[PDB]
Amino acid sequence: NDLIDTTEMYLRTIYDLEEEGVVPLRARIAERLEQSGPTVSQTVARMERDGLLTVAEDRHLELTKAGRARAISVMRKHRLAERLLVDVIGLEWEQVHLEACRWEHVMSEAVERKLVKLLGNPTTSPYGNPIPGLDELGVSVEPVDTDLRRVDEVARSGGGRALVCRIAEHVQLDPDLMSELKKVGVVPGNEIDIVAVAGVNKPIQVQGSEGGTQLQPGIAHAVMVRVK
Amino acid sequence: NDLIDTTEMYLRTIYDLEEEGVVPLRARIAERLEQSGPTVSQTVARMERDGLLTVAEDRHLELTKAGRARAISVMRKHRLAERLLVDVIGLEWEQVHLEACRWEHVMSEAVERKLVKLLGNPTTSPYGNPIPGLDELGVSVEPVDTDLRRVDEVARSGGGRALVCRIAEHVQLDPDLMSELKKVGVVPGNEIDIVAVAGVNKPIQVQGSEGGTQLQPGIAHAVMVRVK
Amino acid sequence: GDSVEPVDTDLRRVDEVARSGGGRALVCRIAEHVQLDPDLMSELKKVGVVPGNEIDIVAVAGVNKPIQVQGSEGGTQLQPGIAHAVMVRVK
Amino acid sequence: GDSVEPVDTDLRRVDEVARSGGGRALVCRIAEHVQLDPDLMSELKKVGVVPGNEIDIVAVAGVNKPIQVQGSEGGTQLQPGIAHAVMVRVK
Amino acid sequence: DLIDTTEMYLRTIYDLEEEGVVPLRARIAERLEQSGPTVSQTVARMERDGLLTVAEDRHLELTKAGRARAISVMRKHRLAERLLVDVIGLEWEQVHLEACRWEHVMSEAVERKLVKLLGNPTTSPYGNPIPGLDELGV
Amino acid sequence: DLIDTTEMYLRTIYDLEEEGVVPLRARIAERLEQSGPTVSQTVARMERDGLLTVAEDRHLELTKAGRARAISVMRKHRLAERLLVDVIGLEWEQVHLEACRWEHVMSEAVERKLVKLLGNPTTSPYGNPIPGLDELGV
DNA sequence: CGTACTTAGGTTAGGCTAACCTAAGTCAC
DNA sequence: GTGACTTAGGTTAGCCTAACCTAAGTACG
Ligand SMILES: [Fe+2]
Ligand SMILES: [Fe+2]
Ligand SMILES: [Fe+2]
Ligand SMILES: [Fe+2]
Ligand SMILES: [Fe+2]
Ligand SMILES: [Fe+2]
Ligand SMILES: [Fe+2]
Ligand SMILES: [Fe+2]
C-alpha cells in the first residue's frame, strides 16, 4: 500500500511509537509499514543524513528538533483531516484513518488554519488523541493525562471498570477491528469493564455497553482509559 | 544469467572494452552484463570505495594498480580455462567461452601453474587473444600487434584480403554467431576477403573459405586481422 | 464530455470573440491553465472576470497580441494563451 | 546410492572395526569430511592410508578415544569423527 | 512535487483537450516544467502501461483506461475545489494548487460524501463541468 | 567463500548421509563454520523452495528435487577431482578444496566430455563412488 | 546442564523501477 | 531556422531478496 511520502510516514510512525510508549526501533517501522529490514535502514540512513533523526548507541531512533517539528506538522494535518472527515464530510468512523493517512501529506498550513476556524479550534481527534503543533498555526490549558492507563496494564493489575479516552493510530489501521469496537461500544467517552489476566502475550477480554470482545496485547497496549 | 562474482566480471568487462579500443563507460557495463544504470553506478561506487578503480571527469572508468592486477588475474584464468577446455577436454568451439566465463572465478593460482605445464606454456587463447599476467605465475618475446587492424576499419578504408588473428570476448558471447563464423571459416589462422563499405553503422560483408556472412559494426570492430 | 465538447454550442473562447470583432459576453469557464497563475486569478477577481459576470471583450487584430477585457470593477489585458482558456456566451 | 548405502555390504567404518577388536583391512573410501583437512590428508598419504592400500586397525575401547592405525610407511592417530568417515574391507 | 507523475500527465493531456490545444509532449514539458527527455521517457512508460498512444501526427491519444483514470483525477480535483471554496473557505486564487495535490489522495468513498454535502454540483467554482459523475453512481 | 550457499548445504547434507551421521542444522553450522541462526534461516528458505523438509525428530530430509540437485553437485565434484589428479596433476591434499569450488560452475556438457577423457570413472581419487552418472546418460 | 534451536534486530552485497537531469544530436515545415 | 523530439549517460529516491552476524532467550533428555 503506497505511503505517498516515505519520509513523512517514517517520522509519524516514530511519533506513533512514542505515543504508545514503545521503543522506536527500525524493526518497528518494518512491521508497521510492511517494508524489508534493509529498506528501513537505508531510508533511516537517508533521513539521518538530511538531519531529521539519529540512531542512538542502543539503536532506538531519536528525532532531531527539525524531525520532531516535521513529525508534529504531519500528525496535526492527520488529526485535523480526521476531524473534517467525521464532523463535516461524514465519512464512516472505521474508514477515516486510512483516508487521513493520505491527506496528511498534501494539506497546506493555509488550509489547516481554515480548518481550525471551521471545526471550532479542535484539541483532540475523533479517536481521543490530542492534536499537537497548534501553537505553530497560531491558536488552551492541556489536560494532564497522567491518570490515563493502558488497557493491558489495567488488566494485568487486576482489571476493573474504566472510561475509554484514546484509541491510538496503531489500532485505527485495522478497519474490521474498528467496526467490531464501534458495535460492542469500545469508543471514546464510553465505560467498559476490563477482565483481569496474568502475564503478557495473553488477549484481554473487555465488556462494552452492546456486548464484549477480545483485544491482542499490542492492541490493548494502544487503548488508553481512566479507571473509575 | 548469474555472474558468480560481480566485482571480477565488472573488472574483466572494463579489460574487454580496453582490448576492443572502446571507452569503458558504466553504460557499456550495463548493456554488456544486462544490468540497470543505477545497479552499475552503485557497484562501481562500491569497487571505487575498495580501491579497484576511479571515475574520471569525462566519466570513463580507470583501473587502479590493484584493479588492473585483479583484472589480469581473472582474464589469465579465463584464457587458460579456454585452452584446457579446447586442447584437453574437447568442449565444442562455440560453448567454450561461456564455460570459461564461470571457471575464471573459481580457479586457484596453484591450478593455473599446473595448466601452464600441461598446455606447454600457452601465450594465446583458442580465439587468438594473448594471455596476460604469466609473469605473476612464474613463466617469451611479445608480438608487436601494431600491424593488426579491425575488420570494420579495413572495410571503411576500402576492404581487401586479410588473415583472421583475434576474435574478442564480446563476439564469443553469441554462440549461434560463433557457429556461423566456424562454418564459413572466419576463425584464427584463416584468410578472408573484407568487402568495402562507406560510413559507420553499416553491416560489413566477409567471404570465408566455405562461404560468406554479415558482421554488425560492433562485431566487426571486435575481430582483428593482418591485411595482405 | 461537456468539459471537452460543450453541450452549449454558443460557448466561445475570449481570443476568438476578440478576433471576430469583440462583444459583451457572460464568463462561463476559466480552465485549469489560467488557475495555475494565482497573481493573475487575483487580478481576474479584482476587475470582475469570474463565472456568472458579464464582461466587454475589445476587438483585436493579429495572433500573439494581448486581448483587452472590461469587467464591472475595471479592465485588464489577457495573453493569447490565457484568453484561449476562458470561455463565454456572447449576449 | 552406492555412496550412501554400499553395494559391497562387507564395507565397514574404521572406528567400528577398531571398537570390534581391530584387524587388517584394505582402505576403500575417504569421505569429503576427511578431505577438508589438507594437513591430515598429507599425513594419511605419508604413512600410506590411501585407497587400495592395506592398513592394520588397532583394537580400541570407549567412544571419544583416538584410533591407532599402522600403514606401510608408519602409523598415525585418527580422531573418532575422522575414523568414522574412512571405510575399509577387512581381509 | 507532482505527488503522482502518471495522474498529472493524464490530467495535463485532459486540460489541453478542454482548451482545444493539440496535446504534444512539448506542451507537458512547459506546463509541468520538465525537460523534453523526461516527458518522452514518462510518456513511453505510460504507452507501455496502456494509458495512451503516440499518433502518426505525434499528438498524445488517451486509451479507454487512460481516459477513465484522467476523468477520475479531474472529478476528484473539481469536487476538492467545490469543498475548499464553499465549505472550508480557502481564498479563490489558492484553491487550484491545493486541489491539484488533493486529487491524488481522495477515495471514491469521500467523493460520494462530497456530492451529498455540496448538493450534487455539476461544475467547479471556476465554471468547469465535473466529469465522470456517472462512474460515482450520482 | 561458498560460491553457492544452496548447493553447499545440499552437498553437506549428502556428505553426512554418506558418513552415516544424522543430518541436523547443528552439523551444517560446524562443517561450513556458520552461526546457528544463519543455518536455520537458510534451511527454512530451502524448505520454502522445496529442496528439503525438517522432520519431527528435526533431521533434514532432501526432497526429490533436493536429492537430484545434491547428486548433480557431488557428481561434478568427484569428476573435477578425477580431472585434477589424473590429468592436471594438482597435489593429492589440495584437490578437494579446488573441486569444492569447481562443482558449482561445471556444465553437464563438460561432465560428459570428462567421462570420455577419464575412461568412464565410477569412483573419485579418494575411493568415493560417483553418483548420478545415469542422469548424464553414461 | 550442555546440545540444538528460536527470537529479535541488525548488517553488506547485489539487484530492480520510477522519475528526474544535461549535452548534443536529428528531423521537419 | 526555430519547434519538437531523440540519443546518450547520468542521477536520487525507494523498493526487493539472499545471506551473513551477535546477544539472549527457550526446549529437552
Ligand atoms: Fe488516525
Ligand atoms: Fe500517511
Ligand atoms: Fe572467451
Ligand atoms: Fe565470468
Ligand atoms: Fe483547478
Ligand atoms: Fe495534481
Ligand atoms: Fe572431495
Ligand atoms: Fe563447494
CSV table of C-alpha atoms in Angstrom, one decimal, chain B residues 17 41 51 73 83 106-107 109 115-116 120-121 155 165 180 188 195 197 212 214 221:
chain,number,residue,atom,x,y,z
B,17,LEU,CA,36.5,-2.8,-23.6
B,41,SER,CA,26.8,3.1,-10.7
B,51,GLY,CA,40.2,1.0,-4.5
B,73,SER,CA,44.4,-12.4,-12.9
B,83,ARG,CA,42.9,-23.6,-23.6
B,106,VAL,CA,36.9,-20.4,-9.1
B,107,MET,CA,40.5,-21.4,-10.4
B,109,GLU,CA,47.0,-19.9,-9.0
B,115,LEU,CA,47.8,-25.9,-16.5
B,116,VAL,CA,50.8,-23.8,-17.9
B,120,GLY,CA,53.0,-26.2,-22.9
B,121,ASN,CA,53.3,-22.5,-21.8
B,155,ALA,CA,36.2,-2.3,-44.7
B,165,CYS,CA,44.1,-13.2,-35.9
B,180,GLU,CA,28.1,-19.3,-38.2
B,188,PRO,CA,42.0,-17.6,-36.3
B,195,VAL,CA,34.1,-6.1,-48.7
B,197,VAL,CA,31.6,-0.2,-47.2
B,212,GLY,CA,30.4,-15.6,-46.6
B,214,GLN,CA,27.4,-10.3,-42.5
B,221,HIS,CA,35.1,-3.8,-34.5
